[PDB]
């Protein structure tokens, strides 16, 4: 009812990844997820009000996941959003770039509710999520 109505965004390359993440989030205990077309759409979904998590791929057709991150990381507005990179991409430099950009966490396939809640509990105690 008078909730945070806290919406997750999940913008992967592959729709099945949004099902997987949503379902694992539901195994944990959450509700209220969405998808987007890519990073360009994703940012404007954040600007549909104030989302709770910005979970994404890396290899978007337009604004890549590190540029989506660094846009949220422009601070003053979107700063507080945990971007959580959940992707098929294990490329070590991608992992560096994300950590360097200050992504709130990284996950590579195959992943579970175990690692989902690991990155969540990190942003709980780290950020205050």
From Swiss-Prot:
InterPro entries: CheY-like_superfamily, Sig_transdc_resp-reg_receiver, ST_Response_Regulator
Entry-annotated residues carrying 4-aspartylphosphate: 57
Annotated localization: Cytoplasm
Pfam families on file: Response_reg
Cofactor: how bound: Binds 1 Mg(2+) ion per subunit.
Record domain Response regulatory: where: 7-124
Cofactor: Mg(2+)
Post-translational modification summary for this protein: Phosphorylated by CheA or acetylated by acetyl-CoA synthetase, depending on which acetate metabolism pathway is available.
Record key words, sorted: Acetylation, Chemotaxis, Cytoplasm, Flagellar rotation, Magnesium, Metal-binding, Phosphoprotein, Two-component regulatory system
One GO BP: chemotaxis
Residues recorded as bearing N6-acetyllysine in the entry: 92, 109
CDD domains, sorted: REC_CheY_CheY3 (cd19923)
Function field: Involved in the transmission of sensory signals from the chemoreceptors to the flagellar motors. In its active (phosphorylated or acetylated) form, CheY exhibits enhanced binding to a switch component, FliM, at the flagellar motor which induces a change from counterclockwise to clockwise flagellar rotation.
Name the record gives this protein: Chemotaxis protein CheY
Gene that produces this protein: cheY
